[PDB]
Amino acid sequence: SCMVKFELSSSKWHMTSPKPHCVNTTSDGKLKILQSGTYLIYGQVIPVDKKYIKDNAPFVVQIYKKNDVLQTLMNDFQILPIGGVYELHAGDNIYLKFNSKDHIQKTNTYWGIILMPDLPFIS
Amino acid sequence: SCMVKFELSSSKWHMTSPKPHCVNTTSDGKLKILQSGTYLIYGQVIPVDKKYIKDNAPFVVQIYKKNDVLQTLMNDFQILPIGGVYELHAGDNIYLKFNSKDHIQKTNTYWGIILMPDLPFIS
């Protein structure tokens, strides 16, 4: 069992074990994958109320795997769930990128990963 | 360990177990929580290209918990990850509502839950 959750409000990771086998984490909210496997990347990014953003800069969130974009998301400054199921390899760095970090409300913004169990049964 | 994943292309649930203890799943793509706990609800809803949209309905996805909306999601027909971390209770029906089924590219659209382990280790 291996899961970690980063809370942007505190810049703390919450973890299943003292030292998770599947991942290393840093205080910037980035991760390095230690175990190759299928991961669920998740989170919610809370934008500042658009009422308070007085330019035309879009609200964009990207998730990167090393130097490759895994996904790019944008909405009109509404709560943004992120991630999905991705196959990852030992050594992969995972991290978020924001069009503007000033768009992000720290309160209730979080992200993380969980190492998925195999799903061999089908109904 | 308890995780399920509904593949909209096939209408099949992929499962950790022959009979997952935490959840009852149905072939309509709905589920009912059997074990009270902290869950990660996840998925990706992939829209068809706007050039194929015939109707006038906006791209909207809702997650329902029993008879009430837990989450309302919307964008301009772009990739939509869904969900987040939620406390759910035995008996909670969870299902997705789309504004228009014709908006959805079934092939890579999926959703599900995973019962989360405790995250007692912080830093």
Curated annotation (Swiss-Prot), chains A, B:
Upregulating conditions: Up-regulated by exposure to bacterial lipopolysaccharide (LPS).
Glycosylation sites: 24
Membrane topology annotation: Single-pass type II membrane protein
Domain THD: start-end pairs: 1-116
UniProt main location, coarse: membrane
UniProt keyword list: Adaptive immunity, Cell membrane, Cytokine, Disulfide bond, Glycoprotein, Immunity, Membrane, Signal-anchor, Transmembrane, Transmembrane helix
Disulfide bonds: 2-22
Statement: the UniProt record of this protein carries the keyword Membrane: yes
Subcellular compartments: Cell membrane
Modification after translation: N-glycosylated.
Disruption phenotype: Reduced levels of pro-inflammatory macrophages in the peritoneal cavity following injection with thioglycollate broth to induce peritonitis and reduced AGTR1 levels in spleen macrophages.
GO molecular function, one term: tumor necrosis factor receptor binding
Extracellular side: 1-123
Tissue: Detected in immature and mature dendritic cells and in macrophages (at protein level). Detected in spleen, lung, heart, thymus, monocytes, macrophages, B-cells and dendritic cells.
GO terms of biological process kind: adaptive immune response; negative regulation of T-helper 17 cell lineage commitment; positive regulation of cell adhesion; positive regulation of inflammatory response; positive regulation of macrophage chemotaxis; positive regulation of monocyte chemotaxis; positive regulation of NF-kappaB transcription factor activity; regulation of dendritic cell chemotaxis
A Gene Ontology term for the protein's cellular component: cell surface
Role summary: Cytokine that binds to TNFRSF18/AITR/GITR. Regulates T-cell responses. Can function as costimulator and lower the threshold for T-cell activation and T-cell proliferation. Important for interactions between activated T-lymphocytes and endothelial cells. Mediates activation of NF-kappa-B. Triggers increased phosphorylation of STAT1 and up-regulates expression of VCAM1 and ICAM1. Promotes leukocyte adhesion to endothelial cells. Regulates migration of monocytes from the splenic reservoir to sites of inflammation.
Subunit-level organization: Homotrimer. Homodimer.
Family classification: Belongs to the tumor necrosis factor family.
Name of this chain's protein: Tumor necrosis factor ligand superfamily member 18
Organism the protein comes from: Mus musculus (Mouse)
